[PDB]
From Swiss-Prot, chains A, B:
This is Basic phospholipase A2 ammodytoxin C. The keyword Phosphoprotein does not apply. Keywords: Blood coagulation cascade inhibiting toxin, Calcium, Disulfide bond, Hemostasis impairing toxin, Host cytoplasm, Hydrolase, Lipid degradation, Lipid metabolism, Metal-binding, Neurotoxin, Presynaptic neurotoxin, Secreted, Signal, Toxin. It catalyses: a 1,2-diacyl-sn-glycero-3-phosphocholine + H2O = a 1-acyl-sn-glycero-3-phosphocholine + a fatty acid + H(+). SMART domains: PA2c. Its main location: secreted. Snake venom phospholipase A2 (PLA2) that acts as a presynaptic neurotoxin, an inhibitor of blood coagulation, and has been found to bind with high affinity to intracellular proteins. The response of indirectly stimulated neuromuscular preparations to ammodytoxin (Atx) is triphasic. The first phase, the transient inhibition of the acetylcholine (ACh) release, starts soon after the addition of Atx and lasts for several minutes. This phase is probably independent of Atx enzymatic activity. The effect may be due to the specific binding of the toxin to presynaptic receptors. Belongs to the phospholipase A2 family. Group II subfamily. D49 sub-subfamily. It comes from Vipera ammodytes ammodytes. The active site is at H47, D89. Ca(2+) binds at Y27, G29, G31, D48. Binds 1 Ca(2+) ion. GO terms for biological process: arachidonate secretion; lipid catabolic process; negative regulation of T cell proliferation; phospholipid metabolic process.
Amino acid sequence: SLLEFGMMILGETGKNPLTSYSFYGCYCGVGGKGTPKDATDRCCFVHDCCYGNLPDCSPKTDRYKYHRENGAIVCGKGTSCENRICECDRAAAICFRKNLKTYNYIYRNYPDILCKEESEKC
Amino acid sequence: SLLEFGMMILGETGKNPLTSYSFYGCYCGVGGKGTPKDATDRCCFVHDCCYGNLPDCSPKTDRYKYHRENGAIVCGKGTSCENRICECDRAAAICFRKNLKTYNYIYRNYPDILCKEESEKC
């Protein structure tokens, strides 16, 4: 669920997701459209796609367990939905971490009106 | 949404909600029933009630903003749903903080089969 996702982002990036990953670019936040602005933004696009591919599940609300093994996120053994939701979240948290090096504060609060390109298909 | 709720619990208690508040007692976790075991557990019962009183809203998934003023949680100015959802979450995070003094690890992983009393009404 989004509870686990927030904690995973914090744990993997060191950043509060509410201040770094909730109103960023065209995709990191509510209502994604247009072309992702950069690699971080593309992480959000891909995560949206990953959730959209699970119409048989409830990715935002289905709780799951995870832990770490040798510093890395390992999803718990849950239902098939929990497993797939957890892997979406894990991939995104890792993506954010790998792309910290090009994170740009200038894309915070980027207005959706300028996300004006034909929205990328998953 | 649950993303903000997790961050609020962490910020107010200092504890990871996934390890302290996700499988505790009869109510802190999935599927609440029976009598709350203690004050912390009752926080979870009350939060469940608070969400249940918002059938016109989507408390687990509707994102909202909050910040702090003089160290205390202040909900952002959002829709009426966002405002009410945020206040449910704020009350619960504060409740957990106020009741840290009686938190008991013995109630972690408490089995739902023993939450066997007629479930308390909101």
